[model samples]
Target chain A: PYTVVYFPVRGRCAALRMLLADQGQSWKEEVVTVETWQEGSLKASCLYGQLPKFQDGDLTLYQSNTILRHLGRTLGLYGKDQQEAALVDMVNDGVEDLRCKYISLIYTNYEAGKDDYVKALPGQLKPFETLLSQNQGGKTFIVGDQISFADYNLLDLLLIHEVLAPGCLDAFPLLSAYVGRLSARPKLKAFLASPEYVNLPINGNGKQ
Target chain B: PYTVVYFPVRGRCAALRMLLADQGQSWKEEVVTVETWQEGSLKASCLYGQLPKFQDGDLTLYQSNTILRHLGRTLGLYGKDQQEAALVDMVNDGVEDLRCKYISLIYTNYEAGKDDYVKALPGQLKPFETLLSQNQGGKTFIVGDQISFADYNLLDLLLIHEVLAPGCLDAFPLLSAYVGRLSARPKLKAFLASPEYVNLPINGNGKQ
Candidate 1:
């Protein structure tokens, strides 16, 4: 059984759970508390002493990006070709950067960081809009014109972004529409509506 | 042809280059200059706008971690065993965290961070020392008693830590001795002595 360890909030593991749902796979999403985190095997064996680790039996991967790629490959939903895989990677890192900036907005107490991040969003959104529009290719998905890791990443990112900070996509209509299309996937939509994904709101203040 | 774009230093590209070296395959390591980075195809196409992107013809991979796995697969050095691959990943992220902390000392430009980093080295060395003694299992390498990505990473990490912060491992005699063994590898020793690696120190420190 695939097990995911993370906070109950939309911290970092939510996307993995969502991706598992897209695969229609049964996995464990354990929302760990501070005490649990202190006592968990995750803390004991975490390579970077970080959270949001994935465990498959005795095998475990700690890096979230590594875990994503592993899961993507396992689910057969990462990409059909190397080029497609590369593109998926590009979009994954791109969306991850967007999330990093959003996370910084909420986590960083530095005044300049907060200011620069807010101002950087509009500029960041433009390229995302262009990339998604190009990827769509008049189709519904990002890679091979089918649902893949990039598509789900795009979906989860847009949702997390809007929830973390509204108006993130006000300047990027294409991506806004792209996110809508991906989230509306019957399996994904049902997953999002499920109890596992309920804690993720479209707007969350900077609080754990 | 596999091409890696990164700074002249051995920050992230070393592992892949080491993999190629171990395999006796040739790769193009294009040292990205600031000016070139500002006006390159990379700047034009990168979705997240970061460096250390890997390309083999049409397949361009972003994210250094992902690129490492790709190179591992390409070079037949990832891991022969399944569980070993995951363990290798566990070690890789630990190296990544150590690198990040070291980076904070230099990149953050804060005296407090530098002080903390130098003081924290001994404790940090404990895990690597333990890993060398325990995980190595009387073998010359970290996985399955054979050389793997973990060995390359460990060697590269030792090079980075020792070169960047001399005396950083003064307390960890085992790791220091392990570094000696790693540095004696013929290919790595040749690479270390080459002009490509030798002339890097000045450029790396941003000094003339």
Candidate 2:
């Protein structure tokens, strides 16, 4: 019923894929080969000239977060109400801010920025830890009582960061437990262990 | 009923301020002084250690786009329908991508990055031009028939870009006209010319 057109990397689509898996939904993957992309036609058709083009029946969308939010809205995972939805957006935006820095370090400045980034990692991650503690002692979801799209995105971010800096979450009790709890979800656990997630590199380059 | 707490610069809050102005909404400004921010107490209290923190009644939110989307939802400026809202998010995401680049250039690498950034400007701006042409010949708003919150953010981005590189929008006729038309709106026009908007440096530094 839905199709995702992207490269072989799990760079941007990991959260959405995790979301679909957790929701027990199915979708099609239209993988864009590097050579095919280099040929130019498909790249030219992209709305923002980027990957992870999403199609839902007649409606087509681009921008990774747009697709995530669309699925969130349709699947009733955004939030319970307006205030909760805003909080969801807030958490996701924080995820995005850190993810951008992580991408820059991984793709553009890994050798140069990695040390400083890792040094500041705890401060960067503290907000989410604080949010979790404020919410039912980190026992519940990221924002509200129910799980929102931000939780999936945050989960993916935490998992990847752990790979980036081993034991990075050890300092943050709430986040460490949160990551473990979320990863234990049945469908998501299976999906993460599947070849589909493990085969692809986290980024285009060999770096984490 | 709303309070925007931030530095004196129009940096991140520009779009939300523009939205509030255009919607004829009244809000108080809790300006954060640089000296006060340097004190560390207020900084410690902040959720993400950032500015443009918005308070709507008892609800406090950070992240500029989250605030814009919150206002968009409350003020009925998100979009007419679910599909349209997704399109709006797509456009806003594009705006955010470009805005992120602009912010980096302004704040981090102005001298070194400006040349290459300007060189790639056209390719970056082309997507919006194409988007406009596809949507009712660019006569209406950014996404759907109605003006959404993204329109305000996009407008601010475009305006700031013009200050960065004069005649930048000349290559994209639709975007140029769209800026002009949006600027011509009565309340927005007054706000643009007001001392509040005019006095603040676009960026914190002396640069545009």
Candidate 3:
């Protein structure tokens, strides 16, 4: 069993949740509230002063991606081979870079900088689209034929960006189809539509 | 032989370079010039429009952390086991998070943001310092007793931050000692003093 400790928001846990759902894995969530976080106890106890802390058996971990990769490794979703693993990491790193930009825009300068951010959005997204285009004409997964952690991360990135900028993925046909195909997966669709996920805002700030 | 394609700046490649040096691995640098970058040809051709691209034999890779992790895996520097591997990734992720902030301040808003950024620097840095404090009373590497890629990344992070904010690590005795101890490693020490690293500014904007 795995336990994830995070804020009530779906921010970073969405991808992890999707991965779990797709894999039919059972996990528990330990939700942190703003009140509890601000009280300083939880924050002080937190190794990095952040959450999405994870526990797999006796081993506790922080850093959201670490958790994802851990689950990926244990669940046999990393990749088929070392070369594919490298490609997986490359895709993940790209996803993270864009995610950082998206978070900054939403949390820090959304009101003032949204226009410029939106204007530059295509260039920021083109790389992923290109990556998809290079692989099986974007018909299959982000990396190999099998799903990897990068697929989950990339899927969440696409979902959140669409929320941030409606119609953003429409320009990239491969991304559009990829999103449609992945989200349509039975378990993922159910999990995404569940109240547990829907009730929580995408970000704590209520931006998206 | 490994080939690292990046701009002359130490921005993203510092940790990977340190890793190569510390391991006594042979590698070549393909430095991209300001003039060439401005022409946009290289950037256009890049998969992610970013550098610190690495080539080992026929496999080429991007994303600095990806390259670091790749070297870590291939060179037996990742960690001793699965749990340790997760910890390594966690440490590297935290380092990257802070490094992103440092890069932003240097390149995008140095004049307006430097003072505030430096003022809050300790809080931002406390996690890594705390990580060190928890492991072997801050006497050893970030994850396991053996050196891992996170150590190189963290070392570069500390070194560059010291340059950006002199004496910033003083408040955290563990980090101060850790930086001192790691920088004393024979190969790393020579690499630090070498003109290749010294002559280059820390950022493309030529701030740090």
Candidate 4:
């Protein structure tokens, strides 16, 4: 069992939640409401002054990618071996880079930047499609035959982008199929339909 | 052997260069001049349209952290075990978050934002100190007993900050000592003094 401390939104934890759900793992959630977060005490104690704190036994972790990688390693979702692992890391890093751009647009300048972001979305997304093309003709997971942890994060990124810009993935055939395939995993599909996930906002502030 | 492709700046590759030098490894530098990069063909092939692209044997890795992590794994610099490796990732993620801020400030808002950035620097840096205090009284590496890849990156972060604001680490004893200790490694010390490092500007714009 593990414990996740985060806000009510599905911002950073959605992908990892998907991972845990698909893996048949159970974890406790400690939600920090807006009022609680503004109080400043918990914020002070947080390692990076951010939410999505994770407690796994004795180790408490911050940073969304750190938690994801930790779960990936412990659960054997990282990759098959050293070379595949590096490629897995490469794919995840690409996801993270785009996630950063998406976060900046959503949080700080959504109203003014949404148009530019949407217009530039295709270029930002082509790399993932290119990556999928390089790996097994985009038939399996993002990197290899096995489902590496990067897939969860990439799936979440692609899903959110489609929400932000409808038909965004209609241009990239492989990404369209990747999201559809990963979304249909038995446990993952159940988790996606649950009230715990469906009811939560995609991001804070009710924007997207 | 490894090959690093990037512009003639220490912005992102500095940490990995330090890592390679410290590990007593030799790597080829494929310098991408401004004219070459401006042509867009090279940039077109890049996965993320970013630099510090690394080649490890047949595999090519982009994103600075991926290169560092790949090298860390192959070179045995990541950490001792699963738990230690997670902690190492935690520290590296923290380093990366601050490095983003540093990059933004230096590249985008140096004149207008430097003062504000310098003012906020201490708070941003305190988490590392706190992390060190929690682990073996701040005597060892960033995570555990042995030096991990994150150490090279963090050491670079701290070193660059010192250049940005001299004496910035004076208030934090653990970090100040940590930088001093890590910087004094024999091969790393020589690399720091070499023309390859000294002749190049810390940034591409010649700002810092």
True contacts kept of each: 0.32, 0.80, 0.70, 0.80
**Clash count of each predicted structure:** 1, 0, 0, 0
Instruction: Give per-residue CA lDDT, model 1, range B24-82, as digits (tens).
Output: 87888777887788777867776557777788877777777667666665565666765
lDDT of 3: 0.90
Report the C-alpha displacement of residue B104, candidate 3, in angstroms.
Answer: 1.8
Docking level for model 1: acceptable
Best by lDDT: 2
Candidates 3 and 4 compared by lDDT, better number: 4
Give the C-alpha interface root-mean-square deviation per candidate. 3.3, 0.6, 1.0, 0.7
Q: Chain B TM-score of model 1, please? A: 0.87
Model 1 spans with C-alpha error above 4 angstroms: A36-47, A110-113, A133-138, A200-208, B6-8, B29-32, B36-42, B110-112, B123-138, B202-208
Q: For candidate 3, lDDT tens digit of each residue in B28-129?
A: 989889888899888888889878779999988999998988889889898999889999999999988898888888889999999999999989899888
**Which lDDT tens digits does candidate 2 get at residues B48-70?**
99888899999999999999999
Docking quality tier of model 4: high
Using DockQ, rank the candidates from best to worst.
2, 4, 3, 1
Model 2 ranges with Cα > 4 A deviation: none
Which pairs of residues have clashing backbones in candidate 3?
A: none
| Model 2 residue A20 CA deviation in Å | 0.7
List chain B TM-scores, each candidate: 0.87, 0.98, 0.97, 0.98
Runs with alpha carbons beyond 4 Å of true place in candidate 3: none
Cα lDDT computed for each candidate against the true fold: 0.69, 0.93, 0.90, 0.92
Model 3 lDDT tens row, A77-178: 888988888889999999988898888888999999999998999999899898889889999999989999999999999999888889998899999999
